[PDB]
């Protein structure tokens, strides 16, 4: 015989008197196959044709005996190697057993898994391809920013964004705590730097027992809660190790059983690092990850689980190739850097050198200033926080340095030409670059079965958890509903907010105004003139039903703020919500057609404005107020010059269109409603457009309160907006316009801010031509960002289920 059976039996002596024992390795006798029965056996995780059926031993870290299923301790893959079941990896696309009434959730994290390893390498990992094959696949996930581990990580498991979660980055200053945060120290296990309910405190305070291994922030007491299970980190556990453990808690008795789990790999984030993302490091790493992936869909499988999880597989961020050729240095910049501390890499932030002390009183202006349009060619953008993008979400926390640098692709920015932290791969840009987009897999019972998803960010996948466990979630920044159609049978059924404020009425009655409120317009210097030009913002039921059915397609935008007098005023080229207390339109709405010549609209007629003889005096704009004020003008929220009849233009001209426009803002402003807005109409079959004011003075994200805006008209309490948003909304089928739409709607949404000069642009002498579009284009947001900061809703006259319209108001244009 051999060594089956047999190990380490020094009394036996099987064919030719081979032997079985410790010390047939030096004597030079053992039977054939003693070292893979008998040493080998001990050190592995899978059964194979020498350990089926085999004795039990002592060091082996799973089993693969005849009684291993009794005891509960098999490797994942006995059943398939030993007793000739079908593998998970071999089954085709699809179940709970006894006591598992409910499914519980696993959450499945490969740090540095961008979205590019699963399109180009797919069929290296298999068994994650079968998980993307057989259950649901989104094209990518999208992280928030900075693109770093631990932000992403705690943002999938609250709901919140960087600035609301307060883990903005991986190394990081709090001057009211005056202490640092990184993770190779102990501070990151302080609970103070850890806002939030992340999604294993959600399920316990909800009755559910969760375990989590090795996930960022469940090593921390936050809330003052340790999950019910939870691992020291260690990096050196090996992969398999982890798996096993998670099938072991699985085996616990259903009292107590967790029903909420978390994963954590560090790969393919370390061998991103190491090699790049396109090397043989990443490439190695990738199946690696995917081996221990179907470890766990194996084990699963022999518990007969592999149908009753809901296991969701998704990673934190992307990886992309930086180069030492291909690095800014802040000495070209400032001849003395000592004064100043920076956050070095692809998303670097500098603060006082002396702190505390200096913290507040750092000139982080003057900072920004200094490194504005330096060189036409240079690869970083100097900002502070709140003239950032606001799709970012990335100002409101005093450990977000005012200073902010936001760096072009493959790029880094750091102190001086020392560093050699380059040549390999990193992350932390911009989260809308490719290289950044993360994956996102799921399968299980409550989600759908072979179905490719759209886009979505990695704040939406904390209310479909809850939605998972069948419990509530904590206030946080995910639209609740819009990943419904991920679910067979959605938990939580969304609906339109209901309307805070009601629109009062703005009617037609006296032809003439009884205030001029200091406008002129000699063109009409009779009163002849002046009544029939007026008399044109008479419009009859029908008319008023005309222009609404073509310029408010989908519903007038509903105000959700509280106390807030607003009216609407009906015009035949566009449609306006007026906001009496400002003095100024809340929204603006007007489609616009598709024309054969593409001629950018003319100036508008100067010289000419009037008063709204529909709103009273105390409720409207003064010419003069501009006048007053040196250093702002007055710009037109529907472009009067797009006027499609003789004298329609005229209906432009008044009091009610006016907003306040710094000289250089609306020269960008005009330049996007003359010719961009003519191509996106051209290009879209027509596109409805909605524009207005935004206050966001305390960088929030949210609408201010009146009391909170803090600069005004000349000396009247007329508010300065921080931004303008302009929502262009389309039919995504082509063949129809947007007022003759019965499918999807498609969005293009942009939140420009409002500042006196073009320095973000660095215009430097070049025609509009040349940097406009760009500027807009850096400032797409969702319409989500639009309804947060103005404390509007729209497209609830929209004829379609809530959670695609939420989809809709999540989506972000990518380019
Ligand atoms: C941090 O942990 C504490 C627990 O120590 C959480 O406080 C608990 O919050 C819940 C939900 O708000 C409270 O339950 C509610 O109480 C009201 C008042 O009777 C009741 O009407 C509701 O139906 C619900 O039962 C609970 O009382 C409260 N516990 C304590 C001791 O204050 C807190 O929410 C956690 N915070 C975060 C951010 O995780
Ligand atoms: C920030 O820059 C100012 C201005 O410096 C000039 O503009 C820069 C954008 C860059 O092009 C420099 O090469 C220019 O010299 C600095 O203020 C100057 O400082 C020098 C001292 O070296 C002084 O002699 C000048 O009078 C200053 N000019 C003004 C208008 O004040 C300032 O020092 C820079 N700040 C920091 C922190 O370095
Ligand atoms: C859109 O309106 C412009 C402007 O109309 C002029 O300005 C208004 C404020 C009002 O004073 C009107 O009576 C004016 O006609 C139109 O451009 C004018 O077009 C006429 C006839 O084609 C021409 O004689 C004028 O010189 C033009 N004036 C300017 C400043 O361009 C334009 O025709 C209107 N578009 C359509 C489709 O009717
Ligand atoms: N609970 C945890 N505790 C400590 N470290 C963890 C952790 N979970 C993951 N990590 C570590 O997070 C690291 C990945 O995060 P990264 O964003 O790549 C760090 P970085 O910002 O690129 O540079 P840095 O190392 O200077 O912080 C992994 O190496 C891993 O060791
Ligand atoms: C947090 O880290 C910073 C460096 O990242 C420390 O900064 C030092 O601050 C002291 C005075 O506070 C200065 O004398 C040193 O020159 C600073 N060092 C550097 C490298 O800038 C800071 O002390 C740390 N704070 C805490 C509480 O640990
Ligand atoms: C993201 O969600 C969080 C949680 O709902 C919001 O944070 C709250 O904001 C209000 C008003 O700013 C504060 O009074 C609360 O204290 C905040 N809570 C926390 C936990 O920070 C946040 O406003 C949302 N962000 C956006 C941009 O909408
Ligand atoms: C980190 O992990 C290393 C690898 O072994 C693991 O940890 C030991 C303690 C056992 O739990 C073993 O089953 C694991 O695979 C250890 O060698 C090392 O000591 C650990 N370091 C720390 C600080 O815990
Ligand atoms: C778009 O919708 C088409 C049906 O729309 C009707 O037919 C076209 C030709 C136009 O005349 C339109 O005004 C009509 O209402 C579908 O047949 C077609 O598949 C759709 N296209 C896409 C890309 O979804
Ligand atoms: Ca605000
Ligand atoms: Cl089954
Ligand atoms: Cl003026
Ligand atoms: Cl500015
Ligand atoms: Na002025
Ligand atoms: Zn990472
Ligand atoms: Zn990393």
Same mark, same amino acid.
């Given at each position: 015989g051999s060594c089956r059976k047999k190990c380490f039996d020094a009394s036996f002596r099987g064919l030719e008197n081979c032997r079985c024992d410790v010390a047939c390795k030096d004597r030079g006798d053992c039977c054939w196959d003693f070292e893979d029965t008998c040493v080998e056996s001990t050190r592995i995780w899978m059964c194979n044709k020498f350990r089926c059926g085999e004795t039990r031993l002592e060091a082996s870290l799973c089993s693969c005996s005849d009684d291993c299923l009794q005891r509960k301790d098999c490797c994942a893959d006995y059943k398939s190697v030993c007793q000739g079941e079908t593998s998970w990896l071999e089954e085709n696309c699809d179940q709970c057993p006894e006591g598992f009434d409910l499914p519980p959730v696993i959450l499945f994290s490969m740090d540095g898994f961008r979205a590019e390893y699963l399109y180009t390498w797919d069929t290296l990992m298999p068994n994650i391809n079968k998980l993307k094959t057989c259950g649901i696949h989104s094209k990518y996930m999208r992280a928030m920013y900075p693109t770093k581990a631990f932000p992403n990580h705690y943002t999938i498991v609250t709901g919140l964004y960087p600035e609301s979660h307060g883990i903005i980055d991986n190394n990081m200053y709090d001057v009211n705590l005056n202490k640092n945060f990184s993770?190779?120290?102990? #501070?990151?296990?302080?609970?103070?730097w850890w806002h939030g309910q992340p999604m294993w405190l959600t399920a316990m305070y909800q009755g559910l027992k969760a375990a989590t291994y090795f996930?960022?922030?469940? #090593?921390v007491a936050i809330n003052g809660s340790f999950p019910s299970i939870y691992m020291p980190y260690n990096?050196?556990?090996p992969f398999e190790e982890r798996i096993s453990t998670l099938l072991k808690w699985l085996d616990l008795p259903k009292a107590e059983r967790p029903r909420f789990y978390t994963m954590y790999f560090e790969e393919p984030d370390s061998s991103g690092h190491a090699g790049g993302p396109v090397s043989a490091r990443v490439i190695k790493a990738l199946q690696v990850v995917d081996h221990a992936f179907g470890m766990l869909m194996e084990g699963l499988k022999q518990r007969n689980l592999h149908n009753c999880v809901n296991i969701i597989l998704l990673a934190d961020h992307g990886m992309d190739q930086t180069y030492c050729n291909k690095m800014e240095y802040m000495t070209d910049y400032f001849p003395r850097i000592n004064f100043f501390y920076m956050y070095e890499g692809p998303a670097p932030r500098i603060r006082a050198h002396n702190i505390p002390h200096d913290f507040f009183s750092f000139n982080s202006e003057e900072i920004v200033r200094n490194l504005s349009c330096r060189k036409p060619d240079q690869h970083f953008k100097p900002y502070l926080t709140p003239d950032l993008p606001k799709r970012l979400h990335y100002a409101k926390n005093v450990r977000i340095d005012k200073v902010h640098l936001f760096v072009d692709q493959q790029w880094l920015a750091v102190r001086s030409k020392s560093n050699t932290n380059c040549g390999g791969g990193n992350h932390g840009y911009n989260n809308e670059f490719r290289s950044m987009e993360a994956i996102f897999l799921a399968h299980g019972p409550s989600f759908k079965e072979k179905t490719e998803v759209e886009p979505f960010e990695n704040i939406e996948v904390y209310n479909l958890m809850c939605d998972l466990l069948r419990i509530q979630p904590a206030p946080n920044n995910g639209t609740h509903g819009s990943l419904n159609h991920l679910l067979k049978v959605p938990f939580y059924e969304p609906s339109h907010a209901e309307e805070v404020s009601k629109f009062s009425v703005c009617g037609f009655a006296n032809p003439l105004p009884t205030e001029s409120l200091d406008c002129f317009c000699p063109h009409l210097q009779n009163s002849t003139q002046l009544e029939q030009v007026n008399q044109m913002l008479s419009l009859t039921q029908e008319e008023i039903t005309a222009t609404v059915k073509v310029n408010l397609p989908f519903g007038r935008p509903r105000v959700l703020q509280k106390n807030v007098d607003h009216c609407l005023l009906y015009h035949r080229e566009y449609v306006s919500g007026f906001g009496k207390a400002m003095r100024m339109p809340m929204w603006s709405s007007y489609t616009v057609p598709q024309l054969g010549d593409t001629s950018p609209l003319p100036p508008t007629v100067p010289d000419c404005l009037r008063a709204d003889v529909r709103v009273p005096p105390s409720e409207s704009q003064k010419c003069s107020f501009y006048l007053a004020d040196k250093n702002i003008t007055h710009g037109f929220l529907?472009?009067?010059?797009?006027?499609?009849?003789?004298?329609?233009?005229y209906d432009a001209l008044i009091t009610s269109n006016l907003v306040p426009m710094y000289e250089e803002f609306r020269k960008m402003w005009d330049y996007f409603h003359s010719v961009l807005l003519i191509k996106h109409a051209t290009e879209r079959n027509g596109v409805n457009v909605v524009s207005g004011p935004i206050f966001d003075y305390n960088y929030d994200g949210h609408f201010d309160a009146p009391d909170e805006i803090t600069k005004h008209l000349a000396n009247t309490d007329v508010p300065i907006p921080t931004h303008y948003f302009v929502v262009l909304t389309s039919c995504k089928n082509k063949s129809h316009t947007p007022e003759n739409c019965p499918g999807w709607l498609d969005v293009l949404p942009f939140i420009i801010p409002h500042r006196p000069t073009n320095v973000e642009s660095c215009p430097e002498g070049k025609p509009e031509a040349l940097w406009v579009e760009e500027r807009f284009t850096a400032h797409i947001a969702r319409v989500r960002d639009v309804e947060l900061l103005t404390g509007l809703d729209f497209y609830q006259d929209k004829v379609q289920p809530v959670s695609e319209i939420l989809q809709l108001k999540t989506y972000l244009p990518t380019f």
């Open positions: 993770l190779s120290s102990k #501070e990151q296990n302080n609970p103070a996930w960022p922030g469940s #090593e990096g050196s556990v529907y472009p009067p010059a797009s006027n499609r009849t003789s004298d329609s233009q």
